[PDB]
Amino acid sequence: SKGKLGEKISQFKIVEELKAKGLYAYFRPIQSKQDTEVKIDGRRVLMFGSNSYLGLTTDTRIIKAAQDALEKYGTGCAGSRFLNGTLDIHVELEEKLSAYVGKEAAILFSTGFQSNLGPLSCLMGRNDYILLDERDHASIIDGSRLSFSKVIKYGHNNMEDLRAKLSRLPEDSAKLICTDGIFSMEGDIVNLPELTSIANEFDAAVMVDDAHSLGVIGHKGAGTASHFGLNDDVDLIMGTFSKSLASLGGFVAGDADVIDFLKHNARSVMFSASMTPASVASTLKALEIIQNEPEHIEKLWKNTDYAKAQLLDHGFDLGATESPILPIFIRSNEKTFWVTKMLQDDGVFVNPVVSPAVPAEESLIRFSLMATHTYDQIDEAIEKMVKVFKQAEV
Amino acid sequence: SKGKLGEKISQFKIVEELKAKGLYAYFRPIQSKQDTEVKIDGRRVLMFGSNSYLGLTTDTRIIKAAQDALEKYGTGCAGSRFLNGTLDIHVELEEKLSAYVGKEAAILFSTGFQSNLGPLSCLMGRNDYILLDERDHASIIDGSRLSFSKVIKYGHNNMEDLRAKLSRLPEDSAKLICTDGIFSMEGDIVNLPELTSIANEFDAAVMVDDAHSLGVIGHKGAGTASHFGLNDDVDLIMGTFSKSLASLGGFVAGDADVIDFLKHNARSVMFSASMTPASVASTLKALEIIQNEPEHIEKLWKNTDYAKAQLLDHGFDLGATESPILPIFIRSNEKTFWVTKMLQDDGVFVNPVVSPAVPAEESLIRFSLMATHTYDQIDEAIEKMVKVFKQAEV
Ligand SMILES: Cc1ncc(COP(=O)(O)O)c(CN[C@@H](CCO)C(=O)O)c1O
Ligand SMILES: Cc1ncc(COP(=O)(O)O)c(CN[C@@H](CCO)C(=O)O)c1O
């Protein structure tokens, strides 16, 4: 019945207002492969709003691997990994990932999102604590909310606040610190040396979410622990396959005993169907290419360094990024919606960040690089961005 | 750091003990397509542990649809639906699903699991209530735990308990009842007529999780509301693509205003990558076949009715199933593990249900039918089950 339900949703008017003003640009229907140009409403649009950092969703070898796995294994496994949903190729990908990030063992999940729900829900329990950077991904706050532990946020990369909040807790309790490796909003890197120093002092477990780090930082893209040389101070490396790895799903890697506990206790792996064969095979073939072909990571960073330099030279106000995410400040929700739509209509795709996710005065567009971007594409997008910022009086 | 973490996982010994006894049969690595026979360790095994109720993960038309979508769209969309992750084919599948289940609108999620997290986390809030059947799927309890509402369980299909618990709540609050349509443990159907009667009396929203219902009950498999004629009394129809639909992902369908709220407020769709093109195309092509080819559902039910009759004739103690799930009671955890492994070693795959998920005295194996099973396969599996039950002294 819908009386109270209708009242619950009644005050959500922003989408109605965006659509009526001709500003709405969510769920834009793409007609073509995710690439540096995408087709929307039959017209070409430059894509600077993607997480495919190495451009690999169009790699014909990765497409063929997926198509061959469909031929051999069909369209789905129709069960949890736990029961009838494990293939030899899931185990192969777990062994490959473990080697890549330098851990004993891994367990796959069918999404990145569920890869955080798993360890955050089932390791810390009653009388235990989870310590979260206040900017952690939504999936980390949700995972932590599914635990029976007490969840404590600390100031963004604030090691004094992390240390202070740990020092307050009972000794006879378990603690886990979970952080994004690269934080996607501003593109900044966790202070992993100080966080792990503090974790070592308080015997707290450390988990790093490397969604935006894999294929981006660390040796051959192996992530944030790899970037800092701190493999031995990180208990759990979590990653996703939806970004550099051009696919769908994720994993948690760590010590064999911890991963054995996880794979038999995490509701998001016991009670959800396993990755499709096609996604296993695309992830396996992408992981080979990231390691075998250093040019992908090199070109990503040459694009990043070029675009960042060009944006700062044209006088854009950038966030404190250390990554291929170039956050461009606008500091008005209205102007952020206007700039986003005007760029869309001029053939540039960027992502808006607005209230209530950030303060009005911190509203921004996110401009992300792919290895497959050309300097010509970057220049065309920045040319169009300068024009639209002028038109919008930012 | 690992001191407290090592202590947290220290008492979990069942997996160690199962493996040391030679009884362990979780995460069995399959080497072949999910089908009525699967290859494990190079030997053929009859599959009675699947959720592919219509056997469609091997349908060459569905494989070809997935392979063609890989060719056209690549391996992944590399973003949320919200941002850069929507394709024309996602929208097509939403329109198709809406028509199938007789609702205005749908939103896809990248798993069934996340399809429950979405509406249960964001519709009921502070001062509101969610009413859950005590046997609801784990994803429904987790979704409900992610809301800021008060979550109340009622007795399994106990309408007196549901009515009593609703009658206690403040009038000036919103309420949502969420139930499995077909409950997977015992294979029983929700009392949707009485539950919706009560929801109408208390103006409570109704959500039905049709994971095990789609392709199984209702007109041309359209699910539990369709089965009872109660489309107009159910606010939200949730389904999964991982079972009959042979794929990965899920959806929530309902009124356009509710679904518009969902797609812009549910963290599991805003902050998780969209379904792979291959999974969209396999789901679309499976949905066409379920409707166009009535023989699949017919054969599923002829297998179900045959196997159930044969099992009751051989004197097995079955659960109160109304579905292709035949729960076979064993009532000893030790015997449930032994029977499961002995059947595996004799070429029969079934799923154990044991403590702590059920009482020892309710431990059982789940025997699920597929449309593609033959009577000869069913007879061979039951022959082997009679032998193993004898050997195990059940
Ligand atoms: C009623 C209901 N609702 C939702 C789900 C989650 O859907 P999934 O994420 O597609 O697996 C399941 C998942 N069932 C299987 C997992 C494989 O689908 C299980 O619990 O073993 C379910 O039974
Ligand atoms: C740090 C981190 N951790 C986990 C996730 C979830 O991974 P996903 O389920 O593969 O999308 C994301 C998802 N990021 C995108 C969604 C598409 O990947 C977003 O929040 O818009 C993330 O940024």
Short mmCIF file of C-alpha atoms in Angstrom, two decimals, chain B:
data_model
loop_
_atom_site.label_atom_id
_atom_site.label_comp_id
_atom_site.label_asym_id
_atom_site.label_seq_id
_atom_site.Cartn_x
_atom_site.Cartn_y
_atom_site.Cartn_z
CA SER B 1 48.63 -5.98 12.55
CA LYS B 2 47.26 -9.48 13.31
CA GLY B 3 47.23 -10.26 17.11
CA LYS B 4 43.52 -9.52 17.86
CA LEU B 5 42.49 -10.52 14.29
CA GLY B 6 44.14 -13.93 14.74
CA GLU B 7 42.12 -14.38 17.98
CA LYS B 8 38.81 -13.37 16.26
CA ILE B 9 39.13 -16.21 13.64
CA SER B 10 40.89 -18.73 16.03
CA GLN B 11 37.70 -20.66 17.08
CA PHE B 12 36.42 -21.20 13.49
CA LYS B 13 37.60 -24.87 13.10
CA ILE B 14 34.75 -26.60 11.17
CA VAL B 15 36.50 -26.15 7.77
CA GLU B 16 39.81 -27.55 9.15
CA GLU B 17 37.88 -30.50 10.62
CA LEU B 18 35.81 -31.17 7.41
CA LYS B 19 38.99 -31.13 5.28
CA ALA B 20 40.95 -33.38 7.72
CA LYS B 21 38.03 -35.91 7.79
CA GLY B 22 37.86 -35.87 3.95
CA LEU B 23 34.24 -34.51 4.14
CA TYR B 24 34.84 -30.98 2.72
CA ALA B 25 32.69 -30.25 -0.40
CA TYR B 26 32.38 -26.40 -0.44
CA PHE B 27 33.76 -24.35 -3.40
CA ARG B 28 33.94 -27.58 -5.51
CA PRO B 29 35.81 -26.39 -8.70
CA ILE B 30 33.64 -27.09 -11.80
CA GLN B 31 35.50 -27.37 -15.12
CA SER B 32 32.53 -27.15 -17.49
CA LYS B 33 29.35 -25.15 -18.20
CA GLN B 34 26.65 -25.23 -15.48
CA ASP B 35 24.38 -28.01 -16.84
CA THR B 36 22.60 -31.22 -15.75
CA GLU B 37 26.09 -32.87 -15.70
CA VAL B 38 29.23 -30.92 -14.70
CA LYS B 39 32.92 -31.95 -14.80
CA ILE B 40 34.78 -31.89 -11.43
CA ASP B 41 38.33 -33.36 -11.22
CA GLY B 42 37.85 -34.55 -14.84
CA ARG B 43 34.84 -36.80 -13.90
CA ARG B 44 31.11 -36.25 -14.70
CA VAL B 45 28.75 -35.35 -11.80
CA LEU B 46 24.92 -35.02 -11.95
CA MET B 47 23.99 -31.42 -10.89
CA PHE B 48 20.99 -31.25 -8.50
CA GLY B 49 22.46 -28.26 -6.60
CA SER B 50 21.79 -25.44 -9.12
CA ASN B 51 19.49 -22.40 -9.34
CA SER B 52 19.38 -22.53 -13.18
CA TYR B 53 15.73 -23.70 -13.05
CA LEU B 54 15.22 -23.53 -16.85
CA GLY B 55 18.75 -24.84 -17.81
CA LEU B 56 19.34 -21.70 -19.94
CA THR B 57 23.04 -20.95 -19.11
CA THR B 58 23.90 -23.36 -22.03
CA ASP B 59 21.34 -22.00 -24.56
CA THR B 60 23.50 -21.17 -27.64
CA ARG B 61 21.16 -18.20 -28.48
CA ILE B 62 21.82 -16.70 -25.01
CA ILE B 63 25.60 -17.37 -25.34
CA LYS B 64 25.58 -15.76 -28.81
CA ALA B 65 23.62 -12.69 -27.52
CA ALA B 66 26.28 -12.24 -24.76
CA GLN B 67 29.17 -12.71 -27.27
CA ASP B 68 27.58 -10.16 -29.70
CA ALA B 69 27.17 -7.63 -26.83
CA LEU B 70 30.89 -8.11 -25.94
CA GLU B 71 31.74 -7.43 -29.64
CA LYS B 72 29.59 -4.23 -29.76
CA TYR B 73 30.02 -2.85 -26.17
CA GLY B 74 33.24 -4.42 -24.75
CA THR B 75 33.87 -6.06 -21.38
CA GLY B 76 32.46 -3.47 -18.95
CA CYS B 77 30.92 0.00 -18.58
CA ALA B 78 33.53 1.19 -15.92
CA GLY B 79 31.07 3.32 -13.92
CA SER B 80 27.81 3.56 -11.93
CA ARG B 81 24.56 3.65 -13.96
CA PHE B 82 24.16 7.11 -12.26
CA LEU B 83 27.20 8.48 -14.13
CA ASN B 84 28.97 6.88 -17.19
CA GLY B 85 27.71 3.29 -16.77
CA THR B 86 24.26 3.37 -18.49
CA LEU B 87 23.85 1.75 -21.94
CA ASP B 88 20.78 1.81 -24.18
CA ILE B 89 20.58 -1.97 -23.51
CA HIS B 90 20.26 -1.42 -19.71
CA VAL B 91 17.22 0.84 -20.41
CA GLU B 92 15.82 -1.73 -22.89
CA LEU B 93 16.07 -4.47 -20.21
CA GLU B 94 14.38 -2.18 -17.63
CA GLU B 95 11.45 -1.49 -20.02
CA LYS B 96 11.20 -5.28 -20.84
CA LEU B 97 11.20 -6.28 -17.14
CA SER B 98 8.61 -3.58 -16.25
CA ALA B 99 6.28 -5.01 -18.95
CA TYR B 100 6.97 -8.62 -17.84
CA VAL B 101 6.00 -8.03 -14.19
CA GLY B 102 3.31 -5.43 -14.99
CA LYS B 103 4.89 -2.33 -13.35
CA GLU B 104 5.61 1.22 -14.56
CA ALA B 105 9.41 1.19 -14.24
CA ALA B 106 12.47 -0.80 -13.14
CA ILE B 107 16.06 -0.17 -12.06
CA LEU B 108 18.78 -2.81 -12.57
CA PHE B 109 21.47 -3.67 -10.03
CA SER B 110 24.73 -5.54 -10.74
CA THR B 111 23.69 -8.41 -8.38
CA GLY B 112 20.51 -9.78 -6.88
CA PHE B 113 22.04 -9.16 -3.49
CA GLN B 114 22.48 -5.36 -4.20
CA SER B 115 18.88 -5.30 -5.65
CA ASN B 116 17.64 -5.97 -2.08
CA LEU B 117 20.19 -3.58 -0.43
CA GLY B 118 18.83 -0.71 -2.57
CA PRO B 119 15.13 -0.26 -1.58
CA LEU B 120 15.51 -1.73 1.97
CA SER B 121 18.35 0.75 2.80
CA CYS B 122 16.77 4.02 1.52
CA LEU B 123 12.89 4.05 1.68
CA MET B 124 12.15 3.53 5.40
CA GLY B 125 14.20 5.85 7.68
CA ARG B 126 14.35 7.16 11.27
CA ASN B 127 11.00 6.63 13.09
CA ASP B 128 9.91 4.13 10.34
CA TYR B 129 9.70 0.29 10.43
CA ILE B 130 10.62 -2.68 8.21
CA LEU B 131 8.75 -5.96 8.83
CA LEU B 132 10.64 -9.08 7.65
CA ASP B 133 9.61 -12.73 7.55
CA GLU B 134 12.14 -14.45 9.90
CA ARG B 135 13.19 -16.75 6.96
CA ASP B 136 13.86 -13.85 4.54
CA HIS B 137 17.05 -14.08 2.45
CA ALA B 138 20.32 -12.81 4.02
CA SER B 139 20.37 -9.93 1.48
CA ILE B 140 16.97 -8.70 2.79
CA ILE B 141 18.19 -8.71 6.45
CA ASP B 142 21.38 -6.94 5.32
CA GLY B 143 19.42 -4.36 3.22
CA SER B 144 17.15 -3.72 6.21
CA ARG B 145 20.19 -3.34 8.53
CA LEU B 146 21.50 -0.60 6.15
CA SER B 147 18.27 1.44 6.67
CA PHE B 148 18.00 3.92 9.58
CA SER B 149 14.65 2.28 10.41
CA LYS B 150 13.61 -0.15 13.18
CA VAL B 151 13.72 -3.77 11.73
CA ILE B 152 11.14 -6.25 13.13
CA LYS B 153 11.05 -9.99 12.25
CA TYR B 154 7.72 -11.88 12.22
CA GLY B 155 7.16 -15.63 12.45
CA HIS B 156 7.64 -17.53 9.19
CA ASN B 157 4.38 -17.05 7.20
CA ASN B 158 2.73 -16.13 10.55
CA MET B 159 0.06 -13.55 9.60
CA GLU B 160 -1.23 -13.30 13.24
CA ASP B 161 2.34 -12.32 14.30
CA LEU B 162 2.72 -9.86 11.35
CA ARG B 163 -0.66 -8.24 12.14
CA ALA B 164 0.13 -8.11 15.93
CA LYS B 165 3.55 -6.46 15.38
CA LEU B 166 2.13 -3.86 12.91
CA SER B 167 -0.79 -3.04 15.32
CA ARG B 168 1.79 -2.04 18.05
CA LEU B 169 3.54 0.63 15.89
CA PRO B 170 2.78 4.39 15.85
CA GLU B 171 0.24 5.49 13.16
CA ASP B 172 2.50 8.49 12.20
CA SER B 173 5.27 6.23 10.81
CA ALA B 174 5.91 4.53 7.48
CA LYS B 175 6.08 0.71 7.31
CA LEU B 176 7.44 -1.70 4.70
CA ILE B 177 6.87 -5.51 4.64
CA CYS B 178 9.53 -7.42 2.71
CA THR B 179 9.18 -11.18 2.02
CA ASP B 180 10.75 -13.86 -0.19
CA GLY B 181 8.15 -15.03 -2.75
CA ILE B 182 9.48 -18.59 -2.87
CA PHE B 183 11.63 -19.20 0.24
CA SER B 184 14.69 -21.20 -0.96
CA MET B 185 15.32 -23.31 2.24
CA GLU B 186 12.03 -25.29 2.28
CA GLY B 187 10.79 -24.11 -1.18
CA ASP B 188 7.48 -22.72 0.29
CA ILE B 189 5.44 -19.75 -0.98
CA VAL B 190 4.59 -16.61 1.03
CA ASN B 191 0.90 -16.22 2.04
CA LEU B 192 0.70 -13.16 -0.26
CA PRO B 193 -3.14 -12.86 -0.06
CA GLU B 194 -3.20 -12.49 3.77
CA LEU B 195 0.10 -10.43 3.92
CA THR B 196 -1.27 -7.91 1.37
CA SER B 197 -4.68 -7.88 3.16
CA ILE B 198 -2.82 -6.84 6.37
CA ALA B 199 -0.55 -4.37 4.48
CA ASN B 200 -3.72 -2.73 3.01
CA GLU B 201 -5.28 -2.44 6.54
CA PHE B 202 -2.07 -0.75 7.95
CA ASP B 203 -1.08 1.17 4.73
CA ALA B 204 2.29 -0.70 4.74
CA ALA B 205 4.38 -0.89 1.55
CA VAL B 206 4.87 -4.47 0.19
CA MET B 207 8.08 -5.73 -1.42
CA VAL B 208 8.45 -9.32 -2.74
CA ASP B 209 11.84 -10.90 -3.54
CA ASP B 210 11.11 -13.18 -6.53
CA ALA B 211 14.66 -14.59 -6.95
CA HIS B 212 13.28 -18.21 -6.95
CA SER B 213 9.84 -17.26 -8.43
CA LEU B 214 10.82 -15.68 -11.79
CA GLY B 215 10.70 -18.37 -14.51
CA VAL B 216 9.02 -20.73 -11.98
CA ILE B 217 5.54 -19.44 -10.87
CA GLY B 218 3.16 -16.79 -12.24
CA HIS B 219 1.91 -16.38 -15.86
CA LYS B 220 4.84 -17.16 -18.25
CA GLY B 221 6.98 -17.14 -15.04
CA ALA B 222 6.24 -13.49 -14.08
CA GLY B 223 6.47 -14.36 -10.35
CA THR B 224 4.59 -14.44 -7.05
CA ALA B 225 2.26 -11.37 -7.48
CA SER B 226 1.39 -12.86 -10.94
CA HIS B 227 0.81 -16.32 -9.30
CA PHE B 228 -1.82 -14.85 -6.85
CA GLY B 229 -3.28 -12.10 -9.16
CA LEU B 230 -2.04 -9.49 -6.63
CA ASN B 231 0.06 -7.13 -8.88
CA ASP B 232 -2.08 -4.19 -7.58
CA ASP B 233 -1.30 -5.00 -3.87
CA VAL B 234 2.55 -5.26 -4.26
CA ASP B 235 4.51 -1.95 -4.37
CA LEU B 236 7.94 -3.40 -5.35
CA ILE B 237 8.75 -6.60 -7.25
CA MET B 238 12.42 -7.51 -6.87
CA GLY B 239 14.06 -10.23 -8.94
CA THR B 240 17.50 -11.65 -9.72
CA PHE B 241 19.05 -12.71 -13.08
CA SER B 242 21.32 -15.40 -11.50
CA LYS B 243 18.73 -18.27 -11.48
CA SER B 244 16.12 -18.86 -14.25
CA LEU B 245 17.51 -15.89 -16.22
CA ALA B 246 20.95 -17.63 -16.43
CA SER B 247 22.98 -14.45 -15.89
CA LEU B 248 24.10 -12.04 -13.12
CA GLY B 249 22.35 -8.99 -11.67
CA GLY B 250 18.83 -8.09 -10.57
CA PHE B 251 16.15 -5.43 -10.57
CA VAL B 252 13.43 -3.69 -8.58
CA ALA B 253 10.24 -2.79 -10.43
CA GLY B 254 7.38 -0.56 -9.31
CA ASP B 255 5.72 2.83 -9.70
CA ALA B 256 7.78 5.35 -11.77
CA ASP B 257 7.99 7.88 -8.89
CA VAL B 258 9.24 5.19 -6.39
CA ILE B 259 11.77 3.80 -8.92
CA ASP B 260 12.98 7.38 -9.77
CA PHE B 261 13.55 7.90 -5.99
CA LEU B 262 15.37 4.50 -5.75
CA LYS B 263 17.68 4.94 -8.73
CA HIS B 264 18.90 8.34 -7.32
CA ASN B 265 19.04 7.38 -3.54
CA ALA B 266 20.07 3.67 -3.25
CA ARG B 267 23.81 3.50 -2.49
CA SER B 268 24.01 0.00 -4.10
CA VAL B 269 23.16 1.57 -7.54
CA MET B 270 24.82 5.05 -7.14
CA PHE B 271 28.16 3.59 -5.90
CA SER B 272 28.58 0.29 -7.82
CA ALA B 273 29.50 -0.37 -11.48
CA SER B 274 26.65 -1.31 -13.86
CA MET B 275 25.91 -4.79 -15.24
CA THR B 276 28.38 -6.00 -17.96
CA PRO B 277 27.01 -5.76 -21.52
CA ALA B 278 27.25 -9.55 -21.87
CA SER B 279 24.99 -9.99 -18.73
CA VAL B 280 22.45 -7.40 -20.02
CA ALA B 281 22.22 -9.21 -23.41
CA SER B 282 22.03 -12.72 -21.82
CA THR B 283 19.24 -11.52 -19.45
CA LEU B 284 17.31 -9.89 -22.35
CA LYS B 285 17.59 -13.08 -24.54
CA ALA B 286 16.69 -15.41 -21.59
CA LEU B 287 13.58 -13.27 -20.78
CA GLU B 288 12.45 -13.55 -24.46
CA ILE B 289 12.90 -17.38 -24.39
CA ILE B 290 11.02 -17.85 -21.04
CA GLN B 291 7.95 -16.07 -22.56
CA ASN B 292 8.18 -17.29 -26.16
CA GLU B 293 8.87 -21.01 -25.40
CA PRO B 294 6.39 -22.32 -22.78
CA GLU B 295 8.07 -25.78 -22.88
CA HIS B 296 10.87 -24.66 -20.46
CA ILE B 297 8.56 -23.92 -17.51
CA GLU B 298 6.37 -26.98 -18.44
CA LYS B 299 9.41 -29.34 -18.38
CA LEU B 300 10.71 -27.84 -15.11
CA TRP B 301 7.37 -28.68 -13.45
CA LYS B 302 7.13 -32.19 -15.04
CA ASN B 303 10.65 -32.86 -13.57
CA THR B 304 9.65 -31.37 -10.22
CA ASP B 305 6.41 -33.38 -9.97
CA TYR B 306 8.20 -36.60 -11.04
CA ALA B 307 11.19 -36.22 -8.68
CA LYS B 308 8.95 -35.22 -5.69
CA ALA B 309 6.67 -38.27 -6.31
CA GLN B 310 9.73 -40.61 -6.63
CA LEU B 311 11.33 -39.18 -3.40
CA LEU B 312 8.11 -39.54 -1.35
CA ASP B 313 7.62 -43.11 -2.81
CA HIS B 314 11.16 -44.11 -1.63
CA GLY B 315 10.22 -42.78 1.85
CA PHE B 316 12.36 -39.57 2.00
CA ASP B 317 11.15 -36.98 4.52
CA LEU B 318 10.61 -33.84 2.37
CA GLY B 319 10.13 -30.23 3.47
CA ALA B 320 6.83 -28.40 2.80
CA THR B 321 7.92 -27.32 -0.69
CA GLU B 322 5.66 -25.73 -3.37
CA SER B 323 8.52 -25.33 -5.85
CA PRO B 324 11.37 -27.09 -7.77
CA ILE B 325 13.37 -27.09 -4.50
CA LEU B 326 13.03 -30.54 -2.84
CA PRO B 327 14.43 -30.22 0.71
CA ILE B 328 15.33 -33.73 1.97
CA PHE B 329 15.59 -33.96 5.81
CA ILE B 330 18.58 -35.78 7.40
CA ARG B 331 18.38 -34.21 10.95
CA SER B 332 22.11 -34.74 11.79
CA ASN B 333 24.89 -32.26 10.83
CA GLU B 334 27.48 -35.07 10.81
CA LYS B 335 25.24 -37.28 8.58
CA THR B 336 24.42 -34.21 6.33
CA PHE B 337 28.19 -33.62 5.68
CA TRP B 338 28.77 -37.41 5.20
CA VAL B 339 25.80 -37.84 2.79
CA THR B 340 26.86 -34.73 0.82
CA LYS B 341 30.45 -35.97 0.30
CA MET B 342 29.45 -39.63 -0.39
CA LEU B 343 26.99 -38.41 -3.10
CA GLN B 344 29.72 -36.15 -4.54
CA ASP B 345 32.12 -39.13 -4.68
CA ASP B 346 29.38 -41.23 -6.42
CA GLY B 347 28.71 -38.43 -9.01
CA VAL B 348 25.68 -36.57 -7.46
CA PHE B 349 25.88 -32.86 -6.52
CA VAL B 350 23.45 -31.70 -3.78
CA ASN B 351 23.64 -28.76 -1.30
CA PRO B 352 23.88 -29.27 2.48
CA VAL B 353 22.03 -27.08 5.03
CA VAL B 354 23.57 -27.48 8.53
CA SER B 355 24.06 -25.66 11.85
CA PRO B 356 24.44 -22.86 12.55
CA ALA B 357 22.04 -21.89 9.65
CA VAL B 358 19.48 -24.52 10.94
CA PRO B 359 19.14 -26.65 14.09
CA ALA B 360 21.00 -30.03 13.87
CA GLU B 361 17.54 -31.73 13.90
CA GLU B 362 16.50 -29.66 10.75
CA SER B 363 19.74 -30.28 8.75
CA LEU B 364 18.91 -31.34 5.18
CA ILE B 365 20.16 -31.64 1.57
CA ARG B 366 18.57 -29.45 -1.13
CA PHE B 367 17.75 -31.22 -4.41
CA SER B 368 16.77 -28.70 -7.13
CA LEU B 369 15.28 -29.51 -10.54
CA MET B 370 16.23 -27.90 -13.91
CA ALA B 371 13.95 -28.02 -17.01
CA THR B 372 16.86 -29.78 -18.87
CA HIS B 373 17.01 -32.72 -16.36
CA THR B 374 15.85 -36.06 -17.84
CA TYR B 375 13.78 -38.64 -15.90
CA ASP B 376 16.81 -41.03 -16.34
CA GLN B 377 19.10 -38.50 -14.54
CA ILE B 378 16.52 -38.06 -11.70
CA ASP B 379 16.19 -41.84 -11.31
CA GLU B 380 20.02 -42.32 -11.22
CA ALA B 381 20.43 -39.58 -8.58
CA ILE B 382 17.56 -40.97 -6.38
CA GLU B 383 19.03 -44.58 -6.75
CA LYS B 384 22.40 -43.22 -5.52
CA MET B 385 20.65 -41.17 -2.74
CA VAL B 386 18.82 -44.33 -1.45
CA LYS B 387 22.19 -46.21 -1.35
CA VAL B 388 24.06 -43.35 0.42
CA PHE B 389 21.19 -42.85 2.98
CA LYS B 390 21.46 -46.62 3.74
CA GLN B 391 25.30 -46.49 4.00
CA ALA B 392 25.00 -43.40 6.31
CA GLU B 393 22.19 -45.02 8.42
CA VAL B 394 19.76 -42.00 8.16
#
